[PDB]
């Protein structure tokens, strides 16, 4: 019949059906355990909570993420997140529907092999595939040529694609992160005397940056003017109706993506990583990549991100280049939309790995590479 | 001439002169008010008492601490504690001597700015500086490389330092506390029927843990043997000569530092916080940090603390590491000794903020960071 | 008196005195700057570190190489590397001794002119010369005829020489590299989940390939057998005593020299480049070149390199040729030894450019070509 399309990352699950316009389930990739006691098992409160249940009952729980930096670090909790995805949120038996699954570009091979083993053995699925976030993100724009830049909760990566050919050699990946921006915002907020210690408070700091942070177009002038004018300062009201006021932290937090030395990394910013990835491509490609830069995933969504990115790339590139950066408003769903398209496309249908073909071939078969 | 060095925390003041071997004044950071009546102002008993006066006349007073978790929460009483430090205990006019002042690593900026404003305006001081407890604590050992772990009345923090470079990114701070161990010991003592309600009784429970508590090397075996044998049980005699007998509470109280879930926090223990802070450092540094772990402040002083800390770190680290933990007996004065050294060091002498330079620059100047 | 002989490349400096058997100083061509802060200049830790200092204090620094692909890309750091060579490591005043200097075969002319200008103006040297790595490498073997193949950190080049005549027309150069093998090994290691991001980790991956990599004699059979048998898998212990296990990556990395399509280049391998360079020589020479193939520089030093090189050339050449490939164990020092010999040789002594002769002639004189 029809095929499930699943995009699961360090910050969310996005799952649904091929050919829908948007995901049906979006929920945090979180499992929570009772913190203050071992369970009153005879009365039988749930021993664990997943997604929006764990976000509702936040304060009593400790919130774990099964996926660190795009790598599944706890399989016991990742089987809970897939079970909760299929049975509770989609209301689907996975026995009927093939599934489409997603990874970051450069990733331990066992992270794919164990995911495949679990999806055939603990769940039963007619056929499966694993796809790259950047390829799907490009199909979501419909373009055949461009350099995708994709930044999620756990990873930032770049993949150049030219005329529908794809280049393994110029892939770049950073572990600079949405999380790695949250953890910086916790520290920088501490400068005002707001201390956010627990993981449940970390979810408050995440929501604070999602509402309030933006990319300063010119950082040094906005730092200068924020000291002089309180006009930048803006208010947030906590779950218990206390109130918070935030100043230069508001733009200073997204600055870490352009200057990771703030968090303390050796890295190029996302702009210098994009320019260096373009320059590693052959000189004929480079004009056509400068004509397309494409942004996907939530960390891209800060206000003014593309205006700064263009302002900094224009200063690096030769001045005779047209430099163009592309954002739909839909960017956070772009990878899932690309997977929906690819799964629906009849041309794809031979690429599914059949369970029998896995059974004879053994786990290595998943790594076979296809366009 | 010579420079005052002041280390003031949630549990004590340690003050004295640069180049002395130890503080000259040590007294509780306490202000006490008459509890049972308003003063007979015409007869004119003192309306407030500070430090050892308030500890001598304990029962009639209510004892307040101006500093909560390293943050000065009452300035009216903190000006009383500085006035009582300089005029009554040191017998010094602060008009002549520059002063050196100390904070926890991550702290509201206004807590430093208001302290500086008060020290120039309400008291007159030729020059001032603010220093970090971990840096001073490392100078007190003389080492150039190590991970300091410093635990006071109000805060626990870690700062890695390598070859005299210092790393802002890997600082960690807990609000687990000497106080937060006292308040647990009050509860755990209640299990035997000794109820300590008032702040004056809280000072008795503090002195009980200071005399009697120790860190159980292996907790579960000592819990098992304490139930069987009364040999662990030991006697304390109260101010009025009544007597108290205390069993497994004696080690169970310091266990909270290793397992803060006892008090009810989400935290790593001090061992897992130290190991995680080492692991956030680059792999070359990590061997040299494992070779040095340094302990400062009174909460470190429980018997067997370092033997347990080493036993638990050795189980976390790769087994080929030499793991070394360092305690002088002097640890409670270590921060003050480090400040004495730093103030005496001629290299430092340009780092003082002159009152005129503050007057022109305004309060922000205090945050400039220096070695 | 006596003459300094200097061989400086993208991966090392090899320097010493003419007529010695080996270099006196060998140290990385690295300059390191404090990464976590700008220096605390008043306390005055060194603002930069060079060679083995930068390798000792690796974790706190960011490591730059001044030379990319045999071209000096940062002169500010290259003057630091020459200063550290003469004053700190050799303990020599360059005012007294003439120096002998080395380049890759085809290289920007300004790279020679600026080096000469610096060596007369910022350092004072009685006379200078620039020499080709392949010529020196051949003098180190003492042969008069052969095709040298020289592979360093940054460049691979070939020069045919016949009866002590040298042929400009058949020089070939590749930017396939020791570095370009390290950067591939970082990626291929990522397949096992070991991520090496920083330049200090890049030095660990360099040391991993230097200890563990080897040239697979037949690649496809060893790929087949490595999957079946764990016997190839071998262990490496990190700076912090963690352990690493490496399988088919161990030979797959040196395979890139034979098949640069792995890294993604259009190139012949070193074998097909050598065969094509021989074939560009006149048919009488070609037998005498097949009788001598000579290997110099560290990238040549992988185990089994010559056995594979001979096995692949023997399959290309006419079967009636004796095909002979020559490796001392000393190959990494071979260029320096050849320069030591050439500088000591009295016949050479007229070829030095005197400082006065440079002063009158102007910079172009350096390019005059001499045997
Ligand atoms: C409701 C919240 C905050 C507050 C009640 C909201 C109000 C509005 O903030 C203030 O401005 C008040 C004040 C404060 C006090 C002095 C000052 O010069 C500036 C601020 N600061 C505080 O009460 C600090 C003190 C503190 C602890 Br201990 N360690 C810390 C580590 C670093 C910094 C500061 C601290 N404090 C106890 C908290 O944040 C607690 C843990 N925070 C929360 O539970 C979350 C859910 C947010
Ligand atoms: C766009 C192009 C050139 C450049 C960017 C255009 C600019 C304008 O040329 C310069 O003048 C800059 C600079 C340079 C550096 C120092 C110097 O005293 C003179 C020039 N030289 C370089 O970046 C060299 C260095 C180099 C490699 Br590795 N091996 C080589 C072998 C021989 C010579 C030099 C080299 N370099 C990396 C390239 O050429 C690359 C491969 N070239 C190209 O992709 C083509 C399509 C043309
Ligand atoms: C000491 C070292 C490695 C390790 C601790 C040594 C141990 C022995 O390796 C493992 O086998 C464990 C594990 C792992 C987890 C799951 C799995 O199916 C296989 C391995 N992988 C990891 O912890 C990865 C995860 C990762 C980050 Br984030 N981005 C990445 C990009 C690509 C791939 C993987 C990753 N990780 C955090 C690291 O490597 C860190 C950055 N590495 C280092 O600091 C250097 C100095 C080497
Ligand atoms: N509107 C927004 N503005 C700013 N940041 C956002 C926004 N929406 C999500 N984010 C951040 O982006 C990350 C989630 O991105 P996403 O691509 O959904 O992650 P994943 O790829 O794991 O699903 C989180 O760090 C979240 O805080
Ligand atoms: N010998 C000891 N044994 C156990 N606890 C102690 C000892 N000495 C001090 N303490 C406790 O440690 C805290 C004082 O630590 P200290 O570092 O002096 O605080 P501060 O940093 O405020 O000066 C108090 O809670 C005190 O009860
Ligand atoms: N024993 C070895 N085995 C494998 N590779 C080596 C060995 N020794 C050095 N190398 C590599 O060769 C390069 C150094 O070669 P070298 O000729 O000394 O460079 P340079 O010409 O710059 O001095 C580096 O990439 C180093 O990793
Ligand atoms: Mg994503
Ligand atoms: Mg202290
Ligand atoms: Mg060389």
């Amino acid at each position: 019949t029809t095929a499930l399309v699943c995009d699961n990352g360090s910050g969310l699950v996005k799952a649904g059906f091929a050919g829908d316009d948007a995901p049906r389930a979006v929920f945090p990739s979180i499992v929570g355990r009772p913190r203050h006691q071992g369970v009153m098992v005879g009365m039988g409160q749930k021993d664990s909570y997943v997604g929006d249940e764990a976000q509702s009952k936040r304060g009593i729980l400790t919130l774990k993420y099964p996926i660190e930096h795009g790598i599944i670090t706890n399989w016991d909790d990742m089987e809970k997140i897939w079970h909760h995805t299929f049975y509770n949120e989609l209301r689907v038996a996975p026995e009927e529907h093939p599934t489409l699954l997603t990874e970051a570009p450069l990733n331990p091979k066992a992270n794919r092999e164990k995911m495949t083993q679990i999806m055939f053995e603990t769940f039963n699925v007619p056929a499966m595939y694993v796809a790259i976030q950047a390829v799907l993100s490009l199909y979501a724009s419909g373009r055949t040529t461009g350099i995708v830049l994709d930044s999620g909760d756990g990873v930032t990566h770049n993949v150049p694609i030219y005329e529908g050919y794809a280049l393994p050699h110029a892939i770049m990946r950073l572990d600079l992160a949405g999380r790695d921006l949250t953890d910086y915002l916790m520290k920088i907020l501490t400068e005002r005397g707001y201390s956010f210690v627990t993981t449940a408070e970390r979810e408050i700091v995440r929501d604070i940056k999602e509402k309030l942070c933006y990319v300063a177009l010119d950082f040094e002038n906005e730092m200068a003017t924020a000291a002089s004018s309180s006009s930048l300062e803006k208010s947030y009201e906590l779950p218990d109706g206390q109130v918070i006021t935030i100043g230069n932290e508001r733009f200073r937090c997204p600055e870490t993506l352009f200057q990771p030395s703030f968090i303390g990394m050796e890295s190029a910013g996302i702009h210098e990583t994009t320019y260096n990835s373009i320059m590693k491509c052959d000189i004929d490609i480079r004009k056509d990549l400068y004509a397309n830069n494409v942004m996907s995933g939530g960390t891209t969504m800060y206000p003014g991100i593309a205006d700064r990115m263009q302002k900094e790339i224009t200063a690096l590139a030769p001045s005779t280049m047209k430099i163009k950066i592309i954002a739909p408003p839909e960017r956070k769903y772009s990878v899932w939309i690309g997977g929906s398209i690819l799964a629906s496309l009849s041309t794809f249908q031979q690429m599914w790995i059949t369970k029998q073909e896995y059974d004879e071939a053994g786990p290595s078969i998943v790594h076979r590479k296809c366009f």
Side-chain angles (χ1 to χ4, degrees), chain A residues 148-262:
Chain A
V148 181
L149 162 62
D150 180 291
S151 198
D153 199 44
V155 178
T156 301
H157 61 86
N158 291 65
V159 182
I161 288 165
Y162 184 84
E163 301 291 284
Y165 301 90
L167 289 55
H169 307 116
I171 295 183
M172 288 190 177
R173 174 186 161 137
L174 311 180
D175 294 328
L176 178 60
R179 293 208 201 148
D180 208 14
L181 282 158
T182 303
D183 303 333
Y184 182 67
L185 185 67
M186 279 168 43
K187 171 179 172 179
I188 205 176
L189 274 168
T190 289
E191 295 187 20
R192 285 184 172 263
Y194 313 113
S195 183
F196 293 92
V197 181
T198 61
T199 57
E201 284 159 327
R202 197 181 307 266
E203 302 301 306
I204 298 170
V205 186
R206 187 180 53 56
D207 193 57
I208 288 161
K209 76 170 180 68
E210 290 184 28
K211 292 194 182 66
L212 297 188
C213 290
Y214 68 94
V215 176
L217 179 63
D218 179 19
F219 178 79
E220 192 168 30
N221 289 15
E222 198 159 9
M223 282 295 283
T225 51
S228 175
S229 179
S230 182
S231 179
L232 288 183
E233 299 182 316
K234 191 163 177 176
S235 178
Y236 184 74
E237 182 162 345
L238 281 159
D240 77 358
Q242 288 173 104
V243 303
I244 292 181
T245 294
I246 307 182
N248 58 50
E249 304 80 9
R250 193 175 162 224
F251 69 86
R252 277 163 71 198
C253 170
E255 191 65 25
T256 57
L257 291 174
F258 299 92
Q259 303 190 58
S261 61
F262 281 10

Side-chain angles (χ1 to χ4, degrees), chain A residues 76-115:
Chain A
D76 179 54
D77 293 337
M78 201 67 201
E79 287 185 319
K80 294 184 201 71
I81 287 182
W82 291 314
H83 181 89
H84 186 89
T85 307
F86 307 128
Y87 294 101
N88 304 107
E89 301 201 39
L90 290 178
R91 295 283 173 200
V92 172
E95 187 266 318
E96 176 181 333
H97 305 277
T99 74
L100 174 66
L101 280 163
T102 296
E103 305 196 64
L106 295 167
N107 210 59
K109 280 200 164 186
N111 186 79
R112 193 176 288 191
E113 295 187 323
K114 289 174 181 181
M115 173 152 63

